[PDB]
Amino acid sequence: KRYVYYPGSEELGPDEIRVIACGTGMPTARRAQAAAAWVVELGNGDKFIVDIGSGSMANIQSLMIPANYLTKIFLTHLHTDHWGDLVSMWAGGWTAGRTDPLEVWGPSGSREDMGTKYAVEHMLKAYNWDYMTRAVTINPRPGDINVHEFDYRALNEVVYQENGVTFRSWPCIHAGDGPVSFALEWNGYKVVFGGDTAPNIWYPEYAKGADLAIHECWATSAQSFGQIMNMVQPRHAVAYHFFNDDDTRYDIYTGVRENYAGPLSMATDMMVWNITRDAVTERMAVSPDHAWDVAGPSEDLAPDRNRASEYTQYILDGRLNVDEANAHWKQEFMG
Amino acid sequence: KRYVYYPGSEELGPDEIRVIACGTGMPTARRAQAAAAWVVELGNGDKFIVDIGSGSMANIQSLMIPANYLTKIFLTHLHTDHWGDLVSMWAGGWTAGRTDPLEVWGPSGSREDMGTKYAVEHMLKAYNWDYMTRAVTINPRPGDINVHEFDYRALNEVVYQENGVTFRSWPCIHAGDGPVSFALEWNGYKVVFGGDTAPNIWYPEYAKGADLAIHECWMTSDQMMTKYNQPAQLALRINLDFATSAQSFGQIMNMVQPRHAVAYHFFNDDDTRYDIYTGVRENYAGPLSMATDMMVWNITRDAVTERMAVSPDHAWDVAGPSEDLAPDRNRASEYTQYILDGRL
Amino acid sequence: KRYVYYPGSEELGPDEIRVIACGTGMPARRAQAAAAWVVELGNGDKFIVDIGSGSMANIQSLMIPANYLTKIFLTHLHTDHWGDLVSMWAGGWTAGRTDPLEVWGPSGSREDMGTKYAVEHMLKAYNWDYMTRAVTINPRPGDINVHEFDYRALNEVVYQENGVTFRSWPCIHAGDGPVSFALEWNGYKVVFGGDTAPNIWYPEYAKGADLAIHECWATSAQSFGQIMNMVQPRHAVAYHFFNDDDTRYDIYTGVRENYAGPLSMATDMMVWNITRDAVTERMAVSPDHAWDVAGRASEYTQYILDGRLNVDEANAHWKQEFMG
Amino acid sequence: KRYVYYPGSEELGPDEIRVIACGTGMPTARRAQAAAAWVVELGNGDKFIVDIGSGSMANIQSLMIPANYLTKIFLTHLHTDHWGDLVSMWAGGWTAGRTDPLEVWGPSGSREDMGTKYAVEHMLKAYNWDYMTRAVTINPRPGDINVHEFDYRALNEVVYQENGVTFRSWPCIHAGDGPVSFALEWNGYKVVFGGDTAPNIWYPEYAKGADLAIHECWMTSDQMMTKYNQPAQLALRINLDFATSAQSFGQIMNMVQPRHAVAYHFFNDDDTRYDIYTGVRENYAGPLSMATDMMVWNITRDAVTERMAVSPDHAWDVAGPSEDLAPDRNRASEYTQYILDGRL
Ligand SMILES: [Zn+2]
Ligand SMILES: [Zn+2]
Ligand SMILES: [Zn+2]
Ligand SMILES: [Zn+2]
Ligand SMILES: [Zn+2]
Ligand SMILES: [Zn+2]
Ligand SMILES: [Zn+2]
């Protein structure tokens, strides 16, 4: 294998997993470091997004994956740094050839309006102008989002079970009731997406023997992160959710290494993990900054001509005549 | 003046404007081009954001301008590529030490549920879990968004007038009723933020003599085909009917006669920029910038200069203060004992 | 094909040429290394044409094993066209190149103005590197074998191996000695103009090139457009200008007054795939954090060796783990 | 103080030094890391280059220092990764408007053909064609290089002394006889540039109490095994015998007790830095930088500060027309009528 990972370029083994950090940073996205996002690709052809915070969509688009393959989204919690770029995935996939609705698994809160189902319904209402104007010229079928809201308090319970893939959830201690951690279990592998938490009694039990154990680390201190991973004994630990600059990262590393000796990644954007029977391998992805979307399906639409136009004649009557300025390139192009 | 703009390094004069392109790209995300965003700094100390598209918050933070100086946001329209980072300016700016509500100017639509007020209302309901948890430990008042929703059909009417600065709005032709252009007037200067439109009769008249005139300039149909794999049909219709083509922008800017025109809202790539430039140059001879992320204009009586910003990968960092940020004690914990009895 | 080229990720077909711009600039800056080109042919042959100051960092990010890039053609002896020869010589021979380098370069009007003089004194310049390295490593890969050809010769063959011809012809640039190259193989013709003011040779000997490279700024944009209209290439490439959001736009305008044909404004890591049916332009996306990929009397006096600091205490703990 | 260093933005104090890492890497080329190169700026206006490795000319250029202010160049040793870019400083510098010869200080070897004097003499012969054609249109005086070859064996002896600035040299153990470390002394400050060495008894004694102490720090035997597939045999050897290991570095800096230590000469990557850092910290507890390209140190009475430089992708002007650059008319053309007759 190449010492760096070029997205689009490597076949996945049937008993292989590929996990890509598409965001690793603090609440704000910064230029070096988008907010929390993960892409899981399974050797069976299944692909999931675990969190999709502010700024992460530029990193996801650089994987060259057709939108119709990235329709299942898991949210750890409803911080803007964990789902702020769902709207970019929603609208941009519905302009880049996604033909299915998006599917989102997210936790409930202590009440209706503290839950993922409420949050997504109001986000779609937020962008009603976008939805209603676009749906005049393009079948809206993909503009939907189907929310699978699970119980936040459930202790390591299944929330997903399709095609030999299980996601399970357990609670986190973070800001307010609702956040959770996920175990992804497939073909004898376990991948643990920590989300955000203060040190709790659930993660060390339910994460145990994970091939890849992701956990927040600054909330959870670097000495705790070390205590937690000592207990879990994962094949590989990943620390994330801190700034990657030349004056904390190194003492974070030290602080972990006080109680945890096992294989350890200090996650940065576009860091990549290959899980096979023999190894857990860490590389960097080298991906286009000047990204475009790549076709996959691009599988017709067939728009309804019954829907009312969102224009009035008052607006349409402002059209400028540009027939002259466009004539030459027009002619030449229609040839 | 240095040939590059280092944010926080240059004092802005009394008769001077600085504009930075914090986003210039598309609804398609890309590390090289955030979606549409413009920061304007005036010599009287007033600062404004016009559009705040998905990803732009990375470039806004690179400017070394504290969050409490960036509370006034103007939106041209309600596409994700123009207001998708509002949520991140809201939540991020709040933890970073803004002490006042966010002020958002935005158009109406043809009915309530097509307007900026409904849009911002539902966005705050969307992030209720975020807001209600934050409001436990920080003053909730910076958490508010005050919307100033103005009539989209209005022809060059003032929507804002305070401390010698005026914003005017006029309509655009884009996807449906609601979208607008802005002209910022201050101290003899006019700055025009075109937003998104097909070629229209209002922009050329109301933009006339602007020191800086920004307008959508589309990728050629060839470049649409080259990538989106289109037929010589829906690639063609885009440049004829729905967007402003490079030739259409040329014609509009010939009419405006600005000191300096800015083309934006295209992928600025090694194999796109040159045929877009030539499209404009067919019908417009005058001073032109092919925008990209972190291009900055300095506006003075003598000159409109174009430079690149050489900016840090800077985040705001949490503003834990005394201040106007003291929490309303009477708010309930958002924890139950079930969660809190889980600490290791 | 993928819309960006990822080096080491694409098999070259038997009737395909790949051409990568490893340097496009002036005398050496961060966006933009000095002139260099890598040509990969579908018969398995690889060449470097120019290796200017800074280019090696781009050549190393291609993930090409060192023993595959041992043939170098120099247009001329400006530092912006062979400054990183030494960095190929030393770093190739660290990276485990087992063969010496072969350098084709032109003569001058006299001995001390040609390539053989230049490379001989280059290796004498780095004698201390050479002589200390040769204590531990076999020095056979340290050699540079120079093929010096007549700078005067009008489109004469300088190289002829495995179905690949290089031809040289003269340039007009600083002084006698600079040349242009045509690479021919399997019906294809790739022209490396090097540096020059407009000359009568290039328009004649570049004619019908699959890819024609020419300096463009010495040669005006307008002049470049005049030349390429006469050359009528499948695809033209302008290079050796600064590519900041300013003068490139007018450079592009200048060319289009006289040349309408396919045209690339070369930047670092720009690559062209040449097939029967197309000449395609993509950008190469490659690692900034590159590594090598595999594919005598002592020079110490005892006075020096006597200065060794004992570091046993300090190195014991890591040592008792690593030995395990 | 801005949290990043913008070059050209910050007046240097009369009691202040700025040091910039213009290359931190290895003999394998890499866009992320040019070969060994250091720029040092004193508050008295004097500036020095210590090492000018292959590829470092890009980073020096980004500092917005004109070429006539960078004529003084000190080499630790004659490896490509410490003087490869001399020729680019030589020819680049001259065209750009250096008025005086290059001044180079470097060590002798055990014989003439192992010294800096021989190396530089043959470098100029190598680029005879460049020199002779340039010498037609510019005054040749800038194209000279005055070499100051000092005894490599001398123990902490002065090799340079002027304007209150002193450089001393002492030997290293690296490849064979000839390599050295420098100490720069000015205004009660000491900056040590270690060059390349295996652990030696001289550096600790002569570097003692440096304000900034730079020393080579090797990747782990672990890391050499992963990348280069070296056997446990030859891997352990590099970090035990020929190189300064991360642990060895920590032993030397614990002895030296600098105000601030700098590790360099290693690939600074997301899977190498952390285990290097950990090796130093086995034996050294004091202030430490793990060097990468465009890191900068400010030395004042109160602090040694580490920041990153946020610099533009700058190339030097290109001098044009001056009086000290006017061409020597006695010089012969290098064109023959055969080449001139080819003009179109
Ligand atoms: Zn959170
Ligand atoms: Zn978070
Ligand atoms: Zn729009
Ligand atoms: Zn838009
Ligand atoms: Zn030249
Ligand atoms: Zn060395
Ligand atoms: Zn070295």
Residue numbers in the entry:
A (entry chain C): 15 to 232, 257 to 373
B (entry chain A), D (entry chain B): 15 to 358
C (entry chain D): 15 to 41, 43 to 232, 257 to 334, 345 to 373
From the paper:
We determined the crystal structures of five PNGM-1 variants: H91A, H93A, H96A, H257A, and H279A. His257 is not directly involved in metal coordination but plays a role in the tRNase Z activity of PNGM-1. As His257 is distant from the MBSs and not involved in metal binding, the Zn1 and Zn2 in the H257A variant are occupied by metal ions. In the structures of all PNGM-1 variants, except in that of H96A, the electron density corresponding to the catalytic water remains despite the complete or partial loss of a zinc ion.
PNGM-1 is derived from a metagenomic library from deep-sea sediments that predate the antibiotic era. PNGM-1 has both MBL and tRNase Z activities and is considered to be the evolutionary origin of B3 MBLs. The wild-type of PNGM-1 has two MBSs in its substrate-binding pocket, and each is occupied by a zinc ion. The zinc ion in the first MBS (Zn1) is coordinated by the residues His91, His93, His188, and Asp210; the zinc ion in the second MBS (Zn2), by Asp95, His96, His279, and Asp210.
